[PDB]
Ligand binder design. Structure first.
Ligand SMILES: C[C@]1(O)CC[C@H]2[C@@H]3CCC4=CC(=O)CCC4=C3C=C[C@@]21C
Length: 250
């Protein structure tokens, strides 16, 4: 029951990343979405660096390393975002960045109102569930290993070993605080269900961004190339079902 794994996750947790949005200019659909894309791009860099420092991660095949990242990035972003929205604005608003927060007016002006409401649900679960900052970190890590191609990775064996241990860490951080037996058996059920909620949501964001990408040109929203590239190559595989989420309760 020693904190070594937790020290690592807290040690690697990324810092405050600013979107670089002009909060002194009147709201707009394209200015809100272009900023979200620039924010996406910069948070990807962090995710890249955050992931490569994970216990066991660097033993995975290079492409597999690069793959689970691209496939799971949206869900990590949504999940982290929902956490910031819980600890910073008590879930009523979406804390994408300190300088890019969505009040209800923006959720609508940006035209992601329905997805926004879905993400706000998520941010609200943290509250109703009483997620400890430790359960959070463990879950955010596990998410990375939550979405894989339908055959497998070019060495599925290790991924599956990595995935199994992270589950154990999550199990550890539950049994290493309060009650036992029925209390933590159900506390585990609850979190895995919570983990599962991220996928549908991430799915929706995937659909939207892809659509936003093909429309981009004629609707003046800008996409940073690294991201534009991931949306156009890796995202289609998810929307088409060639890469699928791994649920706990399927
Ligand atoms: C606007 C859009 O293209 C569609 C959905 C958007 C996603 C929604 C989820 C999200 C959460 C964050 O905390 C980082 C920014 C972020 C996004 C940035 C750009 C995207 C991909």
């Amino acid at each position: 029951c020693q904190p070594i794994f937790l020290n690592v996750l807290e040690a690697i947790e990324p810092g405050v990343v600013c979107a670089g949005h002009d909060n002194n200019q009147p709201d707009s659909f394209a200015a809100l979405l272009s900023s979200l894309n620039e924010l996406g791009e910069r948070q990807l860099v962090h995710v890249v660096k955050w992931a490569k420092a994970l216990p066991g991660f660097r033993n995975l095949h290079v492409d597999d390393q690069m793959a689970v990242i691209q496939y799971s990035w949206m869900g990590l972003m949504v999940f982290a975002m929902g956490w910031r929205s819980f600890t910073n604005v008590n879930s009523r608003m979406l804390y994408f960045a300190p300088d890019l927060v969505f009040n209800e007016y923006r959720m609508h002006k940006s035209r992601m109102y329905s997805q926004c409401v879905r993400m706000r649900h998520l941010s609200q679960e943290f509250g109703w569930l009483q997620i400890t900052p430790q359960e959070f970190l463990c879950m955010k890590a596990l998410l990375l290993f939550s979405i894989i191609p339908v055959d497998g990775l070019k060495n599925q064996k290790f991924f599956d070993e990595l995935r199994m241990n992270y589950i154990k860490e999550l199990d550890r951080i539950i049994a290493c605080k309060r009650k036992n037996p029925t209390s933590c058996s159900r506390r585990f059920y609850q979190l895995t269900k919570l983990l599962d909620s991220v996928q549908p949501i991430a799915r929706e964001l995937h659909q939207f961004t892809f659509d936003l990408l093909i429309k981009s040109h004629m609707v003046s929203v800008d996409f940073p190339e690294m991201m534009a590239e991931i949306i156009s190559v890796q995202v289609p595989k998810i929307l088409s079902g060639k890469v699928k989420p791994i649920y706990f309760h399927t």
